[PDB]
Design a protein around this ligand. Sequence first.
Ligand SMILES: Nc1ncnc2c1ncn2[C@@H]1O[C@H](COP(=O)(O)OP(=O)(O)O)[C@@H](O)[C@H]1O
Ligand SMILES: Nc1ncnc2c1ncn2[C@@H]1O[C@H](COP(=O)(O)OP(=O)(O)O)[C@@H](O)[C@H]1O
Ligand SMILES: Nc1ncnc2c1ncn2[C@@H]1O[C@H](COP(=O)(O)OP(=O)(O)O)[C@@H](O)[C@H]1O
Lengths: 28, 443, 66, 66, 436, 442, 421
Amino acid sequence: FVKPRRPYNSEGMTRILRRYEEDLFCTF
Amino acid sequence: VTRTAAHTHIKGLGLDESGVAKRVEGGFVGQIEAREACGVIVDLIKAKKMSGRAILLAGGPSTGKTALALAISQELGPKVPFCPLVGSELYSVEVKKTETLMENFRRAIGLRIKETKEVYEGEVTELTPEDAENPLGGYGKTISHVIVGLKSAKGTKTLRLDPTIYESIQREKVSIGDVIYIEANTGAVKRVGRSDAYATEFDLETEEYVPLPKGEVHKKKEIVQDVTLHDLDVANARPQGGQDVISMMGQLLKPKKTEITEKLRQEVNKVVAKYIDQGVAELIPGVLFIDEVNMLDIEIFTYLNKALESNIAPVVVLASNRGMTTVRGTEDVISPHGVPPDLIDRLLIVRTLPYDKDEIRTIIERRATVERLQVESSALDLLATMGTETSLRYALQLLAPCGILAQTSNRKEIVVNDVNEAKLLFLDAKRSTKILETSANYL
Amino acid sequence: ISMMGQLLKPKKTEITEKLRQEVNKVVAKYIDQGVAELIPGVLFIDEVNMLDIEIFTYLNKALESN
Amino acid sequence: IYIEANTGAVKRVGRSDAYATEFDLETEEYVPLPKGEVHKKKEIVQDVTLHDLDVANARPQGGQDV
Amino acid sequence: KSLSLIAAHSHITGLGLDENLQPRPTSEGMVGQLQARRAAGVILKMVQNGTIAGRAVLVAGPPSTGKTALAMGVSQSLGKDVPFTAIAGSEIFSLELSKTEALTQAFRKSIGIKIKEETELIEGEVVEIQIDRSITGGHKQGKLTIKTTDMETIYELGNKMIDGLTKEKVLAGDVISIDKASGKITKLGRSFARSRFVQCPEGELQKRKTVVHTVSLHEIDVINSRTQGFLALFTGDTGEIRSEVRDQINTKVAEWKEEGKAEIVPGVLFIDEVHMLDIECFSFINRALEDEFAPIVMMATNRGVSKTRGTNYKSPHGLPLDLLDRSIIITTKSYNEQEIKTILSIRAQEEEVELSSDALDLLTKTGVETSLRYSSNLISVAQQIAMKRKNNTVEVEDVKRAYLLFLDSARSVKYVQENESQYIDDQGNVQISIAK
Amino acid sequence: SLIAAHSHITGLGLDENLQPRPTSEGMVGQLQARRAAGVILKMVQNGTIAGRAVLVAGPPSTGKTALAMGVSQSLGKDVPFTAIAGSEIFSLELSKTEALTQAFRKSIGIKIKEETELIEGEVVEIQIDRSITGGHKQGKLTIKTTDMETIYELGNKMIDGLTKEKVLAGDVISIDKASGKITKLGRSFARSRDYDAMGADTRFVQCPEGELQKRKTVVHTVSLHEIDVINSRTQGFLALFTGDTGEIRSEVRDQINTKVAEWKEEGKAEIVPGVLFIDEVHMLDIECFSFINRALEDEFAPIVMMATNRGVSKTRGTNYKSPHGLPLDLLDRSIIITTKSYNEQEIKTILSIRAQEEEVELSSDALDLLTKTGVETSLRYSSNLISVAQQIAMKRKNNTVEVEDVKRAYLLFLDSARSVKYVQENESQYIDDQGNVQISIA
Amino acid sequence: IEIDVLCDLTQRQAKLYQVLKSQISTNYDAIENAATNDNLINAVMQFRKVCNHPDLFERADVDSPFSFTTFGKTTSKFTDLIYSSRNPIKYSLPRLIYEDLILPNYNNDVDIANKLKNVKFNIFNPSTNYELCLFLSKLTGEPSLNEFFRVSTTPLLKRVIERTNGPKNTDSLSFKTITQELLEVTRNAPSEGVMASLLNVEKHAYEREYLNCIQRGYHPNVSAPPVTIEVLGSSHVTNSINNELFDPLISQALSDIPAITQYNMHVKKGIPVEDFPKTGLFPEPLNKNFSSNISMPSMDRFITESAKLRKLDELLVKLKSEGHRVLIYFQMTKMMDLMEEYLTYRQYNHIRLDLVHDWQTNPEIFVFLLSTNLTAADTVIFYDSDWNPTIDSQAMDRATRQVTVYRLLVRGTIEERMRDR
Ligand SMILES: Nc1ncnc2c1ncn2[C@@H]1O[C@H](COP(=O)(O)OP(=O)(O)O)[C@@H](O)[C@H]1O
Ligand SMILES: Nc1ncnc2c1ncn2[C@@H]1O[C@H](COP(=O)(O)OP(=O)(O)O)[C@@H](O)[C@H]1O
Ligand SMILES: Nc1ncnc2c1ncn2[C@@H]1O[C@H](COP(=O)(O)OP(=O)(O)O)[C@@H](O)[C@H]1O
């Protein structure tokens, strides 16, 4: 079989997001 | 294949069971009385009963004193600590020479302890912090306790942590799904790596992947550890390995030798006596070898005069080349071997004789067999005549350029022309001195 | 320890040759691009009879350098 | 407690003797109640030297008060 | 006891003296030097009196005559908690402390203060613990049952005892000591339960215990200096403790002695090879013994009309005339044959050597012709030769073998003097070549 | 770079038979010393022999340092060559034995093999989750080539390396997984939506092909002293550059010796040796000689090359005199290569090589007079005069350098013997050894 | 058809051999003759146990420093773990010293003289020394005149922690040195710039030397906490020592705040970001390998600890393509080591001591270990270094119509004597 991915905990922190079209910044 | 360096041919003293020695065994040639004396010394050493004994390996240059010291170390074994030293190494700019000598004295005495370790290890499944009701109260910390969940192989337990243990946890930078190793002795944590149950083909930090630790959590394991008393003195003078702020600031500061007081050594002695009385630790005294003891000044000999009277001080062997030579640091006191007459009374001088022509020949033959050189009989005899004419060491150190010239001339055996060319290219001390005396522009 | 050293006294430390070598290498690399220009400058030592023999031996070694 | 009015030093002697049986065993050092007046005033003389002052306000690393 | 192997002075257990300070011919491991032993007994009584401060005595004589043996006898017969500082002469030359302040530290380490204090301590065998956790953990109450060989009681625990009992995990069957004032628990060990082992303590818990503390004045000087913690007592980085903290300590211990809360315990400073000190250190020794809080200083030297270090001239005992004027001199004499024989028999007794009478007389003769430390080194190595031939008794052939293998001073001097060309002289000339 | 005094040597000038040419690789003459240095070079290149001291001796202005730098150029790449002089040993924070041990451990090398993954592709998106204070940094990366598209998790160090060299989407970057390198090779999308803040003009690159991850094996060389400083304290890498490595303990040395032996037995690391060169060895102390005597006999000990120009003189720290300024026990362990002074033909060839390197054209008669002046006083004097004759010639606006130019240079700049003869005639003008002088004219 | 392989001796093997040779002694030549003819037999088996594997002598657990600690040890829903390490050396101070010389008291003068030396006679006091404060405010350019008195009376490391200051007067004598200009340039700057790459060469040396993946070489031998001071009868000493060792500002400074606590603090309780205590000031260690002194026993190192095992694993690397079988022979306990070996690193089909005939029918499986007719096996791999060739003949009585004998041997040991005789 295929092993699962590690659990990614993203709670409580700001997010900087960069994608192909346009850039984001979700802050608290 | 294997790197040879100087007296690598020595495998031991090469004695027999009755206390006698054969002529060519153990890598040695000759010096039968010195070998038997060093065998009696190493038997005394293995008896582990006397303290503050001292011998002297006296003799000329190129005679085998350092060879005898290395033979003693090989006859002793790895568990007994051998602390090689030169007389010039005691002059440090950070600390007085007396404290360097006492640190080496404590470095010679070994110790072997069996230790019990309480170990919490496993995979972090969950990790939640519990905040305080007044995080900016100024007193206490921003969290209160932390619950962490570790599962080993065939086991699972939830741990509730005080902020100091979790401070070490976040200093080692764990995450969810990593294999960790909490040592409950000091609070030290080691991050083993990611668990390999998850996918291991997506990280970008060359992280190692480790299976689950076998057995339950809260293990108790026995570790045998070999330490010296100098390690105890250093670790108590510069305290690291705790989780308070002094141990944390002690790692980052610059290390520096300090004059360790006598009270610390006495407290370490009391604690090691308690460890011995518990039956968990045994005392292993060792050796300390001050090669070129003539380099010490009168102050180090004055301190040795008192430091050999200690009940824990080891057996110390010395070497010297000097004859009737004035002591360094004094003006008119002339003494044998550069050693003052107060230290000579505590000493037990082991003389070492010079070599003959055939002994030089078999020493050169053994050095050729050690270096993987093949030498014909005529070139070996010529090298023996050169050894008796110029010096032994100039004959031993000329085997390598004849080897280079041999592999230059597409041969393996060393012909007489090769040692003649090596005579021509490289000079000994005496021919170069005669060149010095017959030149004008200070060649 | 960085702010500890920044607020403390700047004690002069023996700079190793390795740092000098990487500085010279990167300086020559940016010389090769043409974006920098190295200008040598004259050093003046007054009453050089006052120097020790150790200083003269290091002066010899530095004069044979690049 | 201990409070000095001029300096402001606060020193905690320990818990009172009348509060000793709230628990049968606890770490609180139970000191008895002081037998004198709460407020005590007396005058002293402080013999210092000039050098005491110069080492007081010239510290390479401060924090002599704590 | 501590870590104690066989040393050179291990057989000494004190001064073999009666109640009238008359030395026994052989007592307490020390034999010979009757006048020196009586003088050291007088100095011992002077220390035990405690009314005399800052006296300097000097033991002088030939080497291997027992000056260090006499000082070790004084050190062993002082007792415990009376301070004794033993330093070599080459120790005060420091790269981070001045020589006079190192002498001040060595002076003040040997004066101790004696404070008696009483504390309540709870030391018993724990029957069982019982702690009930709350709904969340805001308040934790629990009960604790401890016992002795006599008594048995149950205690109600508050928050802090439960927090101090979870830390240092205490189970049923443990024997612990609870300090009520400081909240400190120490695990003495597990009791006699078969399932480290220590017997269950006796009854009468909450008992009064008096512990007598002896602290040297150097520790109080380091403590009272606010820039130095007590960790300078172990790491050894004190860094020239100033004079005002020392004078503050001197006045404070004086007022403690007059108040009645403490008692001054004077001690002995012993300086090995005092001739290695320099002239300014001698000057500080001259003007430092005047102080009331000063020990009784023992100096041992063997040099005779030598140069003084740091000056060009020569003075008796390697010491200037004013320091010899300030000191009283104990002279040690050499040993005859019988005293050397008894010393060798005592040393062989301590090193666990069973040796023949004729081999003993041979070692005695070697100790008469050559100095005593050569024979004392020879006994143990001859015993190793004796076990090498599987004999438990040391014979005459073992002593002859040890003589043949390990050289003494005079034979090595002769053997160098006949073959001086092989070694290295003062000019660094050596003939390594063996032929032509 | 700049031109130096030993720049003409580009090797050692010997054949495969260890036979020197009359003039090869910028070196002329000195046939026996060149053959001996080639023998020592081959003995270093074998590598199985350790701790052998070689002492080069001769008169000044002969080519001992020239022979040493020739050995250095012929030593090949990735082999250490610690060239210090005699006076760097004396220090205020290092002991003499410790400074010597640091030199010895600088001179010997470890070649470590590592395994490295190469990832290169266009970046689809970057998601970075930083904490409120910016301390904790975690996130995901989505890199892509034309054949497959994979998503990686990022750590703290990779994200911190991503912030510098700001990586927009559609940027072709190269990731080295082991070294932690980020190399933006260019931008491949050229998006219409362009930010007016950003000023980057990175070049257009082709989209990468093939597999995304590539395994490669790399080798790098690090000396024993570097690993000693690295393992000595926490911030050892900064002390590698600032030199604040104060008296490393012996326990560190024993453990790194055992560790590099373990790395050797695994096939992971290889130990190559080196040449430690000391120039003006007589400047050392006697305790330095004793420690060299007892430290050449260790397993990790390089082939020490030793240079002196001095005859029988006083050995420092002692009251006697010894040959070469070195005591006899160190001379016992050392094999001596001797060097000889030059004739007029070798000095002419040296000056021709120097002039051909220094971009100076000389006539035949100017070369003959330079050869005569070099054989008269010293070779270094004429080698210096080539420069000022060149500068006088370009001040006279002629390309070649003539006899009159070198005569004006000889008149203008003095040598040793002429300055001695000018000092001795005018002894009242200069300050004497007793500090007596007359500054007044009359 | 006839292969005898020879292996050298590793460093741990040589260390165990030389400690056994020095400790046991008892005529090692006669011990060699004892191993020739076959207590003495216990010495011969223990020498062979050293010859086979270090872990056959003693299991190599974690390599950690000696914990010079006394702490709460178990003598044998959650079980809470609390830090309790202490130095076994206990320094005892009487209460008289502490309560008379260090703490304030009515008969003491420590608070009075301390105020008089720190506040009243301070030269930075603006109440009595305003001219000097204004002088230094001209020189340094501080906006606040109480900065000098506050700086002179703080502990230095607390001054390090509370140092973050950006407004400065521009009409001052504090200057921006060329080095400081260059530092402000390389505060934040990317690659391919001349002025930043000429000053970031430490990071270039770190990156080009592959130095983030170098393994740790040295760990300390003993780790010890600071010496515990014990004062009997006073809780003020315990509170002061607990405050000193575990200062919340400083312990908060060398650590971090959990991200959930930061989110619950800033957003939910409305704490501003500047009001957070300062964190993240612990220096970053060189790699992940230098993070802690405990070294986990590498299973890769277990192969290279024994030279016989390393040559066997290399032989299996060459011989995975073909089917063979392995004999572990007369030695006990080597079975579970090889068992753990191939079920820890390199997972192989195997069978270990019916099912024998079941593997005889299965061609793809490799048998590996067995102890001391089987003609279905294509190749038997074994030692041949045994005293009794009758044991060899009984072993090869097991014996596909092919044999290819490989004989495992270690050099520089008693095994070579065994082989010769
Ligand atoms: N008895 C001996 N047998 C074989 N080689 C010897 C013997 N004595 C000395 N040597 C050789 O002589 C050289 C010098 O010996 P060493 O003890 O290191 O210095 P020294 O002889 O000056 O004390 C060494 O290379 C050693 O191999
Ligand atoms: N009276 C004595 N009783 C017992 N042992 C003695 C006596 N005198 C000397 N010794 C022993 O002689 C040895 C050397 O004497 P030592 O005290 O070193 O002389 P010195 O004080 O002159 O250096 C020591 O081992 C010591 O134990
Ligand atoms: N064989 C040679 N090849 C090249 N240059 C040489 C040669 N011999 C001498 N030189 C030059 O002579 C000068 C003196 O040589 P060097 O060894 O540096 O000083 P010294 O000979 O005084 O020790 C150097 O500048 C060197 O360039």
